[PDB]
Design a protein around this ligand. Structure first.
Ligand code: 30I
Length: 245
């Protein structure tokens, strides 16, 4: 996350942390995710396509830190990895950039909800918030685009939604953005998502309850003028989600 503020998992308990085994014992961070249901985490597809085998992957919950074991956390293996059949990578864009992970532990159980671990609700269909709505992104992504490293502590920030009409501008993303994608940004372009945040949530409060409006997907440089963050428009993928569960 570019700018923003640090946080713990108690502020964003649905947040999930996805790591991949090696290939010689090493365990590196891959992407974020959101627990939508006890056995189901949702992520982005582009996160896994290079190494799309579930046995490679580990998923932790109730984890506020990157390489340090947070108290109250739970570790999970991927029982099933479900990438979106119609996915495609444009040079910049990622189409249908949405993934489902079925989680289970070594004891073969899903999550137990705790103070540090809780599900996020999904929108009602096609029911997105008004543009300019302040909305919340979370992840262990780069603090600045020049950084090699990801931050050790979890971060979150605020971004305001942008109408499609607006994001369609050639000045912005031109053609690249579709209506299954959302844009968001800080009016100053001061804070943003970045690499490593991908798969992580975009949670707007809608109808007096918090709601998973988007999944961090792509962007040209973290936090640059006239280049918002682009997120998978979750309201648009509800049947796919529903079915694949
Ligand atoms: C040159 O610097 C630079 N570094 C990283 C990225 C990048 N950004 C995002 C991202 O979420 N961006 C955003 N919300 N603005 C994102 N989700 N993924 C990113 N990448 C991940 C590595 C694979 C190649 C694409 C870049 C772009 N530019």
């Amino acid at each position: 996350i570019i700018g923003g503020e640090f946080t713990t998992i108690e502020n964003q308990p649905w947040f999930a942390a996805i790591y991949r085994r090696h290939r010689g014992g090493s365990v590196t961070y891959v992407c974020g995710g959101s627990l939508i249901s006890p056995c189901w985490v949702i992520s982005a597809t582009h996160c896994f396509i290079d190494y799309p085998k579930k046995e490679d992957y580990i998923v932790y919950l109730g984890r506020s830190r990157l390489n340090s074991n947070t108290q109250g956390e739970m570790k999970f293996e991927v029982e099933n990895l479900i990438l979106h059949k119609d996915y495609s990578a444009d040079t910049l864009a990622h189409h249908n950039d949405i993934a489902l992970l079925k989680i289970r532990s070594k004891e073969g159980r899903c999550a137990q909800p705790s103070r540090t671990i809780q599900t996020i609700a999904l929108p009602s269909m096609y029911n997105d918030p008004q543009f300019g709505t302040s909305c919340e992104i979370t992840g262990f992504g780069k603090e600045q685009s020049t950084d090699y490293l990801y931050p050790e502590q979890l971060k979150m920030t605020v971004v305001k939604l942008i109408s499609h009409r607006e994001c369609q501008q050639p000045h912005y993303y031109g053609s690249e953005v579709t209506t299954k994608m959302l844009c968001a940004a800080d009016p100053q372009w001061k804070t943003d998502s970045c690499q490593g945040d991908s798969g992580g949530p975009l949670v707007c409060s809608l109808q007096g309850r918090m709601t998973l409006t988007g999944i961090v997907s792509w962007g040209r440089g973290c936090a640059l003028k006239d280049k918002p963050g682009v997120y998978t428009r979750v309201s648009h993928f509800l049947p796919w989600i529903r079915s694949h569960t």
